[PDB]
Prior knowledge:
4 copies of one chain form a homotetramer. With 260 residues, chain A is an alpha/beta fold. The first copy, chain A, has one domain (1-260): Rossmann fold. Helices cover 41% and strands 13% of the residues of chain A. Chain A is built from 9 helices and 7 strands. In chain A, strands 3-2-1-4-5-6-7 form a 7-stranded parallel β-sheet, with helices on both faces. In chain A, α1 (19-30) packs across α9 (220-231), α3 (70-84) runs parallel beside α4 and α4 (107-127) packs parallel to α6 (157-177). Chain A is globular, with a radius of gyration of 18 Å. The structure holds potassium ion (4 copies). Residues 53, 56-58, 60 of chain A line the site of one potassium ion (K). Residues 53, 56-60 of chain D line the site of one potassium ion (K). The PDB classes it as oxidoreductase. Keywords: Structural Genomics, Seattle Structural Genomics Center for Infectious Disease, ssgcid, tuberculosis, water contaminant, putative uncharacterized protein, potassium ion, oxidoreductase. The assembly is tetrameric.
Amino acid sequence: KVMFDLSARSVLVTGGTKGIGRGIATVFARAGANVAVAARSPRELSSVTAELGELGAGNVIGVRLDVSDPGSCADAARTVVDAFGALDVVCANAGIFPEARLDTMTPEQLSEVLDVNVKGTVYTVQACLAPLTASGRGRVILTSSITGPVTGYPGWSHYGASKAAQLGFMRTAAIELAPRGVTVNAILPGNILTEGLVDMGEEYISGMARSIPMGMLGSPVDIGHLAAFLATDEAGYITGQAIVVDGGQVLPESPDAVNP
Amino acid sequence: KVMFDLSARSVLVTGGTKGIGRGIATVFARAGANVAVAARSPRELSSVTAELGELGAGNVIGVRLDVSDPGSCADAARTVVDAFGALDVVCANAGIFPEARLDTMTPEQLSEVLDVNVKGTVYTVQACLAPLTASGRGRVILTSSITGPVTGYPGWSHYGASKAAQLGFMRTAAIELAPRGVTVNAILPGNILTEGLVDMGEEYISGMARSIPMGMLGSPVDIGHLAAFLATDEAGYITGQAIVVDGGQVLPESPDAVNP
Amino acid sequence: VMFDLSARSVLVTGGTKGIGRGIATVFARAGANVAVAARSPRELSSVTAELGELGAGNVIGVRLDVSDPGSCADAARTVVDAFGALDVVCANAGIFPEARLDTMTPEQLSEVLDVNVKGTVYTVQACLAPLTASGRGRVILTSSITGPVTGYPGWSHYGASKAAQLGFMRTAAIELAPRGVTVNAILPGNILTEGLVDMGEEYISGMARSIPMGMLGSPVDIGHLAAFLATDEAGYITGQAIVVDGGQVLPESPDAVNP
Amino acid sequence: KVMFDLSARSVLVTGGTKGIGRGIATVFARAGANVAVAARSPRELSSVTAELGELGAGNVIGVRLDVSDPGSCADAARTVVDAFGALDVVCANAGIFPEARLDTMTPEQLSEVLDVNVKGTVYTVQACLAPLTASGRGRVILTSSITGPVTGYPGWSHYGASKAAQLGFMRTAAIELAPRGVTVNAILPGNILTEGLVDMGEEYISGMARSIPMGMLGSPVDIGHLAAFLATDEAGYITGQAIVVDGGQVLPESPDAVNP
Ligand SMILES: [K+]
Ligand SMILES: [K+]
Ligand SMILES: [K+]
Ligand SMILES: [K+]
């Protein structure tokens, strides 16, 4: 066999046109998988989706999806199974991170973050239960964060709640889905260089990198490669994990402990 | 002079008329604190609140509160500060735990659990920010659970998400509130004997106890005594903790590891 | 009386200085009988006199080398002979010398494991009989954020030892539960000790700037949590690792420390 | 451009002749790496070399090694560098797990477990520092366990201490080694089907399997495939992780929570 073969997989990546989701979609496309790249409006980035279509032997398409809308989740799952004939890997990756301190955070700001990041995760997994189950080797991969499960950051207590909520959901979902052969795992990115963050300059970037033992920010494909590994047949006994990808950022006790 | 003195405290306990919340209110009442016992409908259990009033030197009262309603939270905090002249301890305890497997869980079932358990926790803390800050020794204590942060239980993936969400919220909120002198901590109860559980008979209770190294189910005052400790001046350096109270239930590797 | 400790008999290892002395002090104030253990007879008579007047319990000093199992047995016997009981043990003794991974000698690694890990195991083992006889026995381990939570270049052996204590706890809590003994751990962050005061206020303020609470902790912060865990009221709490750090381990980066 | 290419790696696997260590060595051999398998006894060394030499394009050697002995560790690293011209992956996998209840455990029983399981790990990594650093892409992978970091098991408090100690070591070692390009990670196997468990018979194995959501015990290659992933260039931003491979064993709250 080829080790870590993903060429027979059919993958859904929510929030797949940008940032971390795009890194995840890129890796699956290079591995030869069918990949559905979902977005609120896929046509805004259709050249990205077409480019992914050139990277491997699988079929790559865009799908429209509002993750917070349970009907939209159900339509997208249906579309993907009609498209590929299967859906055996789900990367529930979509999420938002607007800023609000506790003394000003409105009920609407709190609800928006919980609707997208928590309900959107639950609805995405629920919509895909039947094809995940039918596959015999189903894989659920959640994009969480260090913020919430591990760290705090003033202005992001709702974001942190939402990212920790994904893990609480996972610890039960993994049990519900295990007898059907489905694993359920989470990836917790640290500081990842995205398209947004690049247009801020080498002084702001390397400033952030100074707190990271590895000495640089991560990339979207760092997240993508772990997701790819988790989706393989070879990872079928790994479930309920929360794996941090952060260049060692959360380890140092204090600024003086960052560098030997 | 007196170690762990709480006789000068003014405490709000949400969901305080029943179960764990009643255990927390009871301990604070015995310790001589002012205690506001909050409930969806306090009059249903006014005899409980009256009895608490006899346990110590503090003023004990009922307060109506729908934690999922941000206006209700604001009204209750105003009522409590008017009543006591202060509000320096908040036990954000209210929570529900209806059952729903992932294959049947409706958007409405998911939303209700997140609204009460997560939003209710956030709104309660937010409503109390001004008096917590004014005290200089503010205390926030969250009632979470082992289910979600530690364990899973088929039928409670939404409950687990909500209980883990409380911790993600805490890890940022503790940072936001620390310079104002406020600590933010959580208690994670295991299997606690409440009224409901009592009715189900000694043989069903003894059956659950067999998985617990300590050999019995906990009581609501086990939770209350930890909350009381966390509220003391003596606990002013403890923040952001998630402390499990479970008689060692989460420790054994398997059934044969439960007893030596 | 809520949280009554006046009927307790407590052994505190490394009890004559810093965190250990903070633990001993709180138990003494609470009215418990307290035995402080150390290697130095001079530090013993001095701390014993200090603690002796704080409450209604008796205070003794005990010579102890925690890395020696025979010395541990002697200490438990000495404590039981003096108090008639031994129902709380604070396994607190530990060392923290620096050694980078590329220079760390077998002697440096072995010493840290012998004192911090083996010393913890031998202390608990020596106390098993009186802990069991009490019906309400309490074991409290002094661990650290370093190892279980954080890393710090120079302290990989120390971190290994502090994490080892928790691995030990998670099983010991189960073996001892049916005897009525709880087994818990406290993980101090940055606590103000004598060696830190000597660094001066600029150095201390610099450390405090990474801590949300805005200051370093106190030995009695550890003492008060140990006292709570020893009460009858904490009888359903076992196998916990509780961090006491003013939120130091929470911020994501320097910019996240202050709102 | 092969994703997850390991064909240029030179790998030392301590305790590599049996059980989990052999599963690790086998996966790396299949992926085309040079593999040195180490054991305390010289007995199995020639045979494992002929057997694994067959599996891929790399070379396989057997190394006699007492991990508790610093000089033996230094000799092993030298042997590997002489044979392969490099040493860029070390799997510090050797460990022992004899039983000893707290009330009978001798100084000798405690010391032996700490010497092999903890000191053996430190000395292995230390002996490999120079070639790990020279490679530019060094990888350290520790075999820990759920027992210690997560669970308790009467009779294994020394074992659990040793397995947790590896992780305390890791959280600092990962910081010290990061600027040299070396990642340091740990795998925590749950219940893996080994020879000894097979010899107990199917009823015993089935009994164990009923506590596992996945419905079966794992295999040594489950550990080996994760080790292989961690060793890739693609996992270069992952450090300080403790990843559990257990089929969901540590998730259920109680026996009734294992199956939905
Ligand atoms: K293609
Ligand atoms: K009263
Ligand atoms: K006295
Ligand atoms: K070969």
